[PDB]
RNA sequence: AUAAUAAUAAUAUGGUAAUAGAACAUUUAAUGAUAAUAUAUAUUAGUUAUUAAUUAAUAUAUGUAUUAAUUAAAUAGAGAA
RNA sequence: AAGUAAUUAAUAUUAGUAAAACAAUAAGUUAUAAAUAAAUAGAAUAAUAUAUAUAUAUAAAAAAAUAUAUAUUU
RNA sequence: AAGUAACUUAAGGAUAAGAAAUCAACAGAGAUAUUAUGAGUAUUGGUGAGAGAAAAUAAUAAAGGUCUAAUAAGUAUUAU
């Protein structure tokens, strides 16, 4: 099991190291000071009241998610609900067709 | 063919071996090619001058 | 001796290059083929410089436009398929359709299939194959010939990426562990084409979800 | 009635004798296909291969200074008129004795030509076939294949000398001596030799080094058409020969 | 599958210098895809059509003679056999006829 | 490398082993002339063999 | 049904600009016998329908042709600036 | 002491392979279908053009142009 | 012609660039940088002279991601 984990791609492994799955990170935006602050969401800083940019910028987050999908390790990553990105089959299914497609 | 080579002292080429189907043919070949050169060393084939007479 | 000092080119291969400015009896003597004394003698005028008259790239009006939205399909005639079958190169298991990927594999179509394949009807008489075909589209006559043979055509939509995936699914698997999903037709023209029963478009023939959704939207 | 009376099926396998190295002793025959070892000798193809290889090999270091490269000033030496002498510009002109060259090359001069891969393969086969015909293609092996006659006690099936690196008594070593003895036996002292190995035979190349000017030890991958044809007698490993055949076979 | 077969399976007639392939006999090998090597060629700027026949093993002259016998309708003059590469050129677009003649044996 | 003459490309399009072009003299001053006579100038025209070589040189990738 | 050489009959063979075909000298690279009775260069006189090479004599060098030949190439040929 | 080199395009001759070629990692270029400004069009319904394909035109033909078809695809 | 020659200034062993307010197109990709194809294609021009991408696929390449910022205002945007 440990060997299989080690065999995972580098970026994914790094992510797991620095945001581990024992902590249930929040689905919604949070305080930046919070422990359960989602790195994919923009969390608000409590003093200044300014939204900090996500700790994992959007591309990196997407890459991480794709890696997780590849190796079946999605649920151990923190939730990507309130980040607007969907991926692959879920994206395909859930999306509404454009107004131009349905109503030319 | 190996035996023939060993007794002879000379090497019969691979292509020749492939071609010749009988002991008689082999003998004839030997008589043609090696024998005269063995008899007379000046008559022998030289590499640098292959079109010698 | 080694062959290396007695090798020639094949007769008719090589030539002597015309060597100028190297004596009178050579032929290409002093003037060196230039003629005598002009601009071309010692300098450079352009080959297509017409002298000052309005040139043949100016007299005439500029015509047409380049349709950048165009995506030219590679044409495959029924005749070629028939020939392949006769030669016993058309390797198909029963039930397996002769798709664009399959065609490529076989060598029916060859070179890069960028946008798709159209099936044309240049040997529709001697076509007698009951196998099922699938391409970007087909000629009406070709379709009719296929039907007569006891075959079954389906015009299938493929975006360039989707087409690529179809052609070489293993590459995508190797790279990413997952072949990409096949896109819907976003364009209006594309939707219209595959909604035609006369074209044997996949949206009507397979009774697709997209078409139904569009109909529902129209109703509402 | 009979359409093509003289039609027939050609022969497909030539027998090459598999030998033990130090002393070229027949161990087995091995039927290599006719396309590799007994093609009709087409000179034109061979020529094409050789010239192309030569062109590839070119260094192309010719670098004469043009009138720009040459290092004089740009100043006009004598005024256009009122000098009583011919018209001159700068001192770099090809016309003058210290000036730069007209139409000067500039290194690196790329002399690389191209060849179709199939043509090159055909040439490679052809050279090998020619060598076989000559009686200058010594296939050494017996490790993989099933033998007829057993290998000798002091020979070995691969193309290498034993205990070459060992040198305890005197400065002279054994592998060199063995090589010299071999040369003496087969009457090829001054002749060009070409040892086509499969893997790096370090001891063999050490043994050769004394006769480096005539003996060329090459790998299975880096062997050339030129190398094959220049050779007075090639000494190829069976495995290496197989590999070459595989490489330069016409695909089906 | 194996490049060099074993010594047992190879017959004597399969070897070189057996069955007399050189003397007045020939072979015409098919292409990779499995077709007869007979081609139209449009030389001198599409002006000169000629039919080329490739991949001939053995005696080309004999083969040419046999083809002439088969096709008397083509003249005797128009059969140029280039000896360096061993291929036999015919003047017209006489490809299909040649193929028909060859198919039965090759 | 060599490149296409863009004006020439705009004027001329390929037709097998030739180039086709529009006719000159049908952009203004058409009124007064016979319409039937004018219909000669409406279509396209194949390149004259005189300037075929020039056209080829202008359009190397055609 | 080709190639080389030689016969016979016929026709053709002045040439600037130009086009086409075929050679030779020189230098380098690949292959390469041989040897002071030899090779190279020069001079003189012979020879071969002869920008070339060869024979002999004479001279000077060298223990020796990147030699003959086939290819590949060129800073490849000078009474004209 | 003077027609040279590089990157390209078009012809020709030969050689390799050939309905494919080059390349083999995929990708690409050329060929395999002719058109048309362009579009969702594209080559015998029962044979040589008197048939068919495309562009103009059209209900569909005819008409101009080019192309495609008479054991084996070029 | 050319942001070339030149002059001027400033740095380092290299500099520059670099982990998307990027591309793409409803399918998707995932720093940089150089090369090959894409392609002399799209694009543009007193529509003359001429100029001319990108996506995508390959190589070369290194572990290539990673916080150092309390997440940014006379800024984005607009007019000129
Ligand atoms: Mg003249
Ligand atoms: Mg003059
Ligand atoms: Mg003039
Ligand atoms: Mg004027
Ligand atoms: Mg060359
Ligand atoms: Mg009139
Ligand atoms: Mg004359
Ligand atoms: Mg010179
Ligand atoms: Mg002089
Ligand atoms: Mg003179
Ligand atoms: Mg209309
Ligand atoms: Mg500028
Ligand atoms: Mg500047
Ligand atoms: Mg830096
Ligand atoms: Mg580019
Ligand atoms: Mg930021
Ligand atoms: Mg912000
Ligand atoms: Mg502004």
From Swiss-Prot, chain B:
Function, in words: Component of the mitochondrial ribosome (mitoribosome), a dedicated translation machinery responsible for the synthesis of mitochondrial genome-encoded proteins, including at least some of the essential transmembrane subunits of the mitochondrial respiratory chain. The mitoribosomes are attached to the mitochondrial inner membrane and translation products are cotranslationally integrated into the membrane.
Task: Return the similarity comment.
Answer: Belongs to the mitochondrion-specific ribosomal protein mL50 family.
Query: What part of the entire protein does this chain span?
Result: 160 to 212 of 264
The name on file for this protein is: Large ribosomal subunit protein mL50
Taxonomy of origin reads: Eukaryota, Fungi, Dikarya, Ascomycota, Saccharomycotina
Name its species. Saccharomyces cerevisiae (strain ATCC 204508 / S288c)
Q: What subcellular compartments does it reside in?
A: Mitochondrion
Misc: Present with 1350 molecules/cell in log phase SD medium.
Describe its assembly: Component of the mitochondrial large ribosomal subunit (mt-LSU). Mature yeast 74S mitochondrial ribosomes consist of a small (37S) and a large (54S) subunit. The 37S small subunit contains a 15S ribosomal RNA (15S mt-rRNA) and 34 different proteins. The 54S large subunit contains a 21S rRNA (21S mt-rRNA) and 46 different proteins.
UniProtKB/Swiss-Prot annotation, chain C:
What does the UniProt entry say about where the protein is found? Mitochondrion
- Keywords, comma-separated and alphabetical: Mitochondrion, Ribonucleoprotein, Ribosomal protein, Transit peptide
Principal location = mitochondrion
Query: Compositional bias (Gly residues) at which positions?
Result: 24-36
- What are the BP-aspect GO terms? mitochondrial translation
**Cellular component aspect of the GO annotation:** mitochondrial inner membrane; mitochondrial large ribosomal subunit; mitochondrion
Give an example GO molecular function.
structural constituent of ribosome
Q: Residues annotated as region Disordered? A: 12-42
Q: What does this protein do?
A: Component of the mitochondrial ribosome (mitoribosome), a dedicated translation machinery responsible for the synthesis of mitochondrial genome-encoded proteins, including at least some of the essential transmembrane subunits of the mitochondrial respiratory chain. The mitoribosomes are attached to the mitochondrial inner membrane and translation products are cotranslationally integrated into the membrane.
Q: How does it assemble?
A: Component of the mitochondrial large ribosomal subunit (mt-LSU). Mature yeast 74S mitochondrial ribosomes consist of a small (37S) and a large (54S) subunit. The 37S small subunit contains a 15S ribosomal RNA (15S mt-rRNA) and 34 different proteins. The 54S large subunit contains a 21S rRNA (21S mt-rRNA) and 46 different proteins.
Q: Which family does it belong to?
A: Belongs to the universal ribosomal protein uL15 family.
Q: What else is known?
A: Present with 5350 molecules/cell in log phase SD medium.
> What is the official name of this protein in its record?
Large ribosomal subunit protein uL15m
Which organism was this protein described from? Saccharomyces cerevisiae (strain ATCC 204508 / S288c) (Baker's yeast)
Residue span relative to the full protein:
58 to 277 of 322
Swiss-Prot record, chain D:
Which Pfam families does the protein's record reference?
A: Ribosomal_L4 (PF00573)
- Compartments where found: Mitochondrion
Q: What does the UniProt record say this protein does?
A: Component of the mitochondrial ribosome (mitoribosome), a dedicated translation machinery responsible for the synthesis of mitochondrial genome-encoded proteins, including at least some of the essential transmembrane subunits of the mitochondrial respiratory chain. The mitoribosomes are attached to the mitochondrial inner membrane and translation products are cotranslationally integrated into the membrane.
Keyword terms, alphabetized? Mitochondrion, Ribonucleoprotein, Ribosomal protein, Transit peptide
The biological process GO terms on file are:
mitochondrial translation
Gene3D superfamilies xrefs:
3.40.1370.10
GO-annotated molecular function: structural constituent of ribosome
Which domain of life does the protein's organism represent? Eukaryota
Q: Which InterPro entries match?
A: Ribosomal_uL4 (IPR002136), Ribosomal_uL4-like (IPR013005), Ribosomal_uL4_dom_sf (IPR023574)
Q: Please share what else the UniProt entry notes about this protein.
A: Present with 1200 molecules/cell in log phase SD medium.
For region Disordered, the annotated ranges are 57-104
Oligomer and partners: Component of the mitochondrial large ribosomal subunit (mt-LSU). Mature yeast 74S mitochondrial ribosomes consist of a small (37S) and a large (54S) subunit. The 37S small subunit contains a 15S ribosomal RNA (15S mt-rRNA) and 34 different proteins. The 54S large subunit contains a 21S rRNA (21S mt-rRNA) and 46 different proteins.
Q: Which family does it belong to?
A: Belongs to the universal ribosomal protein uL4 family.
The protein here is known as Large ribosomal subunit protein uL4m
Q: Which GO terms describe its cellular component?
A: mitochondrial inner membrane; mitochondrial large ribosomal subunit; mitochondrion
UniProtKB/Swiss-Prot annotation, chain E:
Where is the chain membrane-spanning? none
Q: Name one GO biological process term.
A: mitochondrial translation
Is the keyword Metal-binding assigned to this protein?
A: no
| Molecular functions (GO terms) | structural constituent of ribosome
Question: Looking at the keywords, is Transmembrane helix present?
Answer: no
Q: Which GO terms describe its cellular component?
A: mitochondrial inner membrane; mitochondrial large ribosomal subunit; mitochondrion
Identify the keywords attached in UniProt to this record, alphabetized. Answer: Mitochondrion, Ribonucleoprotein, Ribosomal protein, Transit peptide
Q: Where in the cell is it found?
A: Mitochondrion
The further comment given in this record reads: Present with 1700 molecules/cell in log phase SD medium.
Question: According to its UniProt record, which protein family does this protein belong to?
Answer: Belongs to the mitochondrion-specific ribosomal protein mL49 family.
Q: What does this protein do?
A: Component of the mitochondrial ribosome (mitoribosome), a dedicated translation machinery responsible for the synthesis of mitochondrial genome-encoded proteins, including at least some of the essential transmembrane subunits of the mitochondrial respiratory chain. The mitoribosomes are attached to the mitochondrial inner membrane and translation products are cotranslationally integrated into the membrane.
Q: How does it assemble?
A: Component of the mitochondrial large ribosomal subunit (mt-LSU). Mature yeast 74S mitochondrial ribosomes consist of a small (37S) and a large (54S) subunit. The 37S small subunit contains a 15S ribosomal RNA (15S mt-rRNA) and 34 different proteins. The 54S large subunit contains a 21S rRNA (21S mt-rRNA) and 46 different proteins.
**Name of the protein described by the UniProt record:** Large ribosomal subunit protein mL49
Q: Which residues of the full protein are shown?
A: 41 to 146 of 146
